[PDB]
From Swiss-Prot, chain B:
The modification N6-succinyllysine is found at residues 9, 55, 69. Belongs to the histone H4 family. The modification N6-(2-hydroxyisobutyryl)lysine is found at residues 9, 22, 37, 55, 57, 69. This is Histone H4. The chain holds residues 24 to 103 of 103 of the full protein. The modification N6-lactoyllysine is found at residues 9, 55, 69. The modification N6-acetyllysine is found at residues 9, 37, 57, 69. There is a cross-link at residue 69 (Glycyl lysine isopeptide (Lys-Gly) (interchain with G-Cter in ubiquitin)). The modification Phosphotyrosine is found at residues 29, 66. The nucleosome is a histone octamer containing two molecules each of H2A, H2B, H3 and H4 assembled in one H3-H4 heterotetramer and two H2A-H2B heterodimers. The octamer wraps approximately 147 bp of DNA. It comes from Xenopus laevis. The modification Phosphoserine is found at residue 25. Transmembrane segments: none annotated.
Amino acid sequence: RHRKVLRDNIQGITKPAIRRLARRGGVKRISGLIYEETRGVLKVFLENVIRDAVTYTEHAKRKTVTAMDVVYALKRQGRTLYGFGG
Amino acid sequence: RDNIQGITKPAIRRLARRGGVKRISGLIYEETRGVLKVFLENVIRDAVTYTEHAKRKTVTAMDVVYALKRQGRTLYGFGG
Amino acid sequence: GGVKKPHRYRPGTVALREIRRYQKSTELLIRKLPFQRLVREIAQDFKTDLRFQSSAVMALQEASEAYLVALFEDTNLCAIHAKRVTIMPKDIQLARRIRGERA
Amino acid sequence: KKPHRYRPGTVALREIRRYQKSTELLIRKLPFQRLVREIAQDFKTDLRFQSSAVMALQEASEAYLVALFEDTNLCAIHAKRVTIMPKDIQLARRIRGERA
Amino acid sequence: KTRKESYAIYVYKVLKQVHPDTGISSKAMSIMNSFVNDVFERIAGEASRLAHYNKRSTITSREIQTAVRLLLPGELAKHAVSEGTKAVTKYTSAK
Amino acid sequence: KTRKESYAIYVYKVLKQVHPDTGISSKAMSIMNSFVNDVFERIAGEASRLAHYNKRSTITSREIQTAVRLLLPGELAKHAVSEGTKAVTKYTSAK
Amino acid sequence: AVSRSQRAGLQFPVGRIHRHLKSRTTSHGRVGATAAVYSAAILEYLTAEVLELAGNASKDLKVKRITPRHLQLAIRGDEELDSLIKATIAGGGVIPHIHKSLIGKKG
Amino acid sequence: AVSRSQRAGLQFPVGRIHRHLKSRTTSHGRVGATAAVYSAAILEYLTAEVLELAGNASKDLKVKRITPRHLQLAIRGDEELDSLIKATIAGGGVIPHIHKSLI
DNA sequence: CCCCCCCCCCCCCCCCCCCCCCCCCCCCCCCCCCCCCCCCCCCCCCCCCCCCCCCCCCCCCCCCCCCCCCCCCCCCCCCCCCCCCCCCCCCCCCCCCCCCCCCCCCCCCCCCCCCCCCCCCCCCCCCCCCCCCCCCCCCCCCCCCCCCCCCCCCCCCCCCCC
DNA sequence: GGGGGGGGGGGGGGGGGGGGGGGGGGGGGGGGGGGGGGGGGGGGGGGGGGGGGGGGGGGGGGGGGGGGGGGGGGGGGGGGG
């Protein structure tokens, strides 16, 4: 029976988290503009994946997005994932 | 004269131009040839595997088309 | 000086120390709750009233960090090709144009 | 006698225009046919080829190399050059996931 | 000599409604036929995967529809779906 | 019903043969389970088309072999083909 | 007789599409009555969309027949078709284009 | 009564694999006697190859259970397995590596 | 007669001597929770065994089309001269990394209720199958028509050089 | 600036490979109607898992400052298309 409005959660991918991801990817020095670029690239990636996952969910007339929905959506886009299904 | 050298600088130069390339280093010619050899090996290997399975001795356009598709290099205009 | 110059690693030394560290571990590098809200927010803007199995969200996080990390390796190759050690937005863009993506 | 010479890069731009305008194949045919048959011979002997098969292989190869030259050029330009070099072809194949 | 089915005559009919005075070369028709075969394959394939994910055996117009939403980019999908609902309707209401 | 098939007991058997004193975490078994399903879907898929292209309706061990030569990298293919062959020959030697 | 296709108001072969769907099936599976209709309308629509753009590409060249080059022009030129059609179009060439930094003499 | 697996000298389930092939059939599709046998052998062999290498890695790390990190070192580490397995392995991190020009 | 004998110029090259506080790192150690691990049935599930089709192979027949050749036609390779371009170095400012400090929001642990989803069970609208009727599309053969595309002529514009 | 030499463009033209229009066929689709069978939707039903709410505390995050570093720019040279 209540609420809470989600806004600007992309800023939750913080500068330290982006730096950690770059370190694992072997990056040594990061310019100041990389952070807003990474956020934009992550938003698009998730939009494309969430869009397909939610399409499988609705098709099945469910209201719950399942790990399988995500796994089939990742597969359709050529990004197979092992560890939940594939 | 080795066959791979039948793919000549002039032909390689024309492909680059269609690719919008303006100036070409001299080492590019051997590199392009290696790249084409690998591409052709990957595709012919799959085409010939379809031929043998069909028990023929003639590689057909379809065998090449199914080989290209398998590799994510779908081609239109030759059947299939 | 008295207690003399307080020790200071040169720029780059801690950064290399960091690559060695994160490259040998496997944990998720983005905080969990904030990543869950980002997921709920994008989902909501497509269809309201959706619920999520917690493992569905974990699957999106693993996929996302695996996608970003591989994109930073490619971006790092574009910076070095340009004789720099600093990755820039143009390096990320070059990597995505060649990968055949866009946005 | 007749002293007329175009500046380095002028004919080159003319070629880019001419070749992006046209659609014909650019590798001479027999040489390509020979290359194909030789590569095939290591996978199976006494092989024959439909004519349309050799043609499909040539159309696929040229579309592939042309597209590889476009990415290669982007890598040279990224490095502030206008001349493509083997390291640009390499960077481009590496990012495409083809590795070699 | 065994019959090779093709979509050529139907592609030509659609061509005529679209540019009544335009023609189409042989090599171009071959391309269109490859295009039509390719799209039907990607669509039936996704639709049967949809059916299987949901423990079902029938490929209904509803699977074809979700498959179109998964395969086509925004606008193309908007109109395509629209063209699909419209054919089914006109066909459902008949004798 | 509710019972879901898994390849885990079989993966454990194979692990015991190659590393008798080695265990596998559940996360790791989950990955192996996905890996096996993935490879099987890929082989059956190639075998089907393969059969299709040849106007055959039966998927035999011959289609599976060609599917395997198309899917595995050079050396993995040779060893897999020889293990496939060995198991067919033995199987038919009992009937 | 009428015919499924005529009955649906389409040019694409509903009967044939249906038959084909019965073969892209799960062992013992079925095909809905209208599924073929829907599929046929989707293929008809996309075919129309490409012919329409390829057809414009040839008229703007003052020619009567659509060629592979016209199909390549129409497809790479539209964001949505470009995205949907990744296949190589034999005989189509590329869209003309020279990077600003190669075009020059500069000043 | 000998199982078809036992009859083939395999650990992987032939009967089940045969069942799964019959249902991905395609209408009037038939599945030959030996197709499932050959399939179970390819599957068991690939599985054996991946475990052999993961198990070596869990061992060079003085540890008993294979983890996703071990599966990932084993797969990225082998040219052919790396080529065959493009999937993302959740929890596997990456292979340590730093470009010479950054050191 | 240019190369040869100068000429000085950056370039390196030992040489001095520690560091040194983190930075791992590696061994040890110990709770802990999850991973097995029996039990416990049990629906499943895979094997067998006739009984009945059946599709595929295989030899044969057919016959376009592949390779090969000859005659005719064309792209390639070339050595050379030139100039720009890539590379290298130097210079400089800006920017980003290291460190510090303070803070707080993510995490962890619990539970709990309610949604919602799966599973089963019931029911029935819907699809398949079948045979019959019919139309029918791909093919062959044909064969008149035609859109194209290379070519030509004339003119305009651009580029390079002076 | 001009010439000098080219390429390029535009419009027009012609033959010929390509395309089309025709007739003819026939095994094979296509459609029909009737019968029978089957997939599935609803309708509970029960159980399982997902937000949600609570509280406590420390690691994560942010901001700030400083300096070292690194990128960009410019010039020049020999060298390579």
